[PDB]
Amino acid sequence: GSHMGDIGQLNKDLTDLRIARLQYMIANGDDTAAANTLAKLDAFSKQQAYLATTFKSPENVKLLGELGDTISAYKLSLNKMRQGYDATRAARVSMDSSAIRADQAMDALSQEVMARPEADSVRLAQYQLISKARQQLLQVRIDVRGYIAENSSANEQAALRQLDAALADTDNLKRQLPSEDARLQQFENAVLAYRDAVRQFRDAVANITTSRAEMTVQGADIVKRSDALYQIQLER
Amino acid sequence: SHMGDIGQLNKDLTDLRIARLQYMIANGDDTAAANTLAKLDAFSKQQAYLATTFKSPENVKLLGELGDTISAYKLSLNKMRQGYDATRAARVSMDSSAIRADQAMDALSQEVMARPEADSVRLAQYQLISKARQQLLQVRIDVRGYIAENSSANEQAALRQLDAALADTDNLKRQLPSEDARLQQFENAVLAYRDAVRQFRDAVANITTSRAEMTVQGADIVKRSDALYQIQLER
Ligand code: NA
């Protein structure tokens, strides 16, 4: 009954892989957890390969072949999820740096105005406008971070609309303060890059969700075939 | 046939472990909580069923041990659920306190313009009001960073930055002695916000604790279930 035992080891390896992959997502797809998942996958793959050499009956060797095919597909889906998580990380890094660049551009502009020898009433009006723009972008960051924490289409779309509204108002501000165009453009270009990064984060979340949906199917398929190997052995 | 019955038990167990992790991935939302509760009593039911049909004393005791761990698991899962509820409550509280603070700061900056004074003084005042506004906005960004990624580093950075905001809000009253009432209103709201960040932090701790407990319970349940399975196999 040793072969029945071998299948026990395989089915345990499967559960362990499924648990590991969910842990990986819980850990926000971090590199440490990715290592652990890759390990559980290799343990499961190694055991499939091992039994492919030791089982002898044609229907068993074939079922093991089928299991091996799904394991190959699973490795590809898992790779896509990993690329997905890397892309969300890269996007977040890009958002942080683009935001800082934007704020610094407004920071430099505000102190360039506080330095100017023009009328106080003029400086006051200008400072009010600039601060309103800085704070609008900060609220956009709050919305985007809300979306990063909770990836709903509702949070996505709200963030995207509010970001476009800030870009629109930045266009307008350029017309209102033409003397400061050079600076406003620094700002706007950074906000445009920030928007590119938010879109990249959104697209990466989609790829993660797609891969997950794929491994859900593969897991169900692997469970099915491994169950069938088990039943054959039990029948002996 | 009893071997098959344990088969069902072991499958229900896996389905429960899978469901509970899905629950956490779903940010502990009520829909996935419902699904987890459902997998839990499917497994509980199978334990209870088998407790009536298995006859060997050693099997019956194994099923009783399983049942005890199920009872503990339900309590831990309940603690996790309460934690997610608390994180959600704290977030609601953070949002409302932030809005209240911002409105107080709006009313402060707009009964500043209604007062007759020099423009240079008006420019100096708006500079520090805006400085305080943006400071709190940045704190919210830090706190949302923490909500997305619950690290000790993110936690502590947010807490420090929040304490610096409260410190500067005391200083702002020194610089705008005329507006002490309104700044106190602002300060109250930021203190309440801090209370809420701390409440969120404590609830995360409780989720983590219950998670660690269910990890242990799961390994205990797997062990006992495997033992039932081996008895049938050697039979
Ligand atoms: Na009050």
Curated annotation (Swiss-Prot), chain B:
Binding site for (S)-malate: 17-22, 211, 215
Disruption phenotype: Mutant fails to respond to succinate but responds to toluene.
Mutation effect (residue 20 to A): Abolishes binding of malate, fumarate, oxaloacetate, succinate, isocitrate and butyrate. Decreases binding of citrate
Intracellular or extracellular location(s): Cell membrane
List of residues binding acetate: 95, 140, 144, 193
Outcome reported for the amino acid change (mutating residue 17 to A): Abolishes binding of malate, fumarate, oxaloacetate, succinate, isocitrate and butyrate. Decreases binding of citrate
Binding site for succinate: 17-22, 211
Residue ranges that the UniProt entry lists as topological domain Periplasmic: 3-235
PTM comment: Methylated by CheR2.
Coiled-coil segments: 148-202
Start and end residues of each HBM domain: 3-235
Record function comment: Chemotactic-signal transducers respond to changes in the concentration of attractants and repellents in the environment, transduce a signal from the outside to the inside of the cell, and facilitate sensory adaptation through the variation of the level of methylation. McpS is a specific chemoreceptor for 6 tricarboxylic acid (TCA) cycle intermediates (succinate, fumarate, malate, oxaloacetate, citrate and isocitrate), butyrate and acetate. Malate, succinate, fumarate and oxaloacetate cause the strongest chemotactic response.
Subunit structure, as described in the record: Homodimer. Exists as a mixture of monomers and dimers in solution. Ligand binding stabilizes the dimeric form.
Similarity comment: family membership: Belongs to the methyl-accepting chemotaxis (MCP) protein family.
Designated name of the protein: Methyl-accepting chemotaxis protein McpS
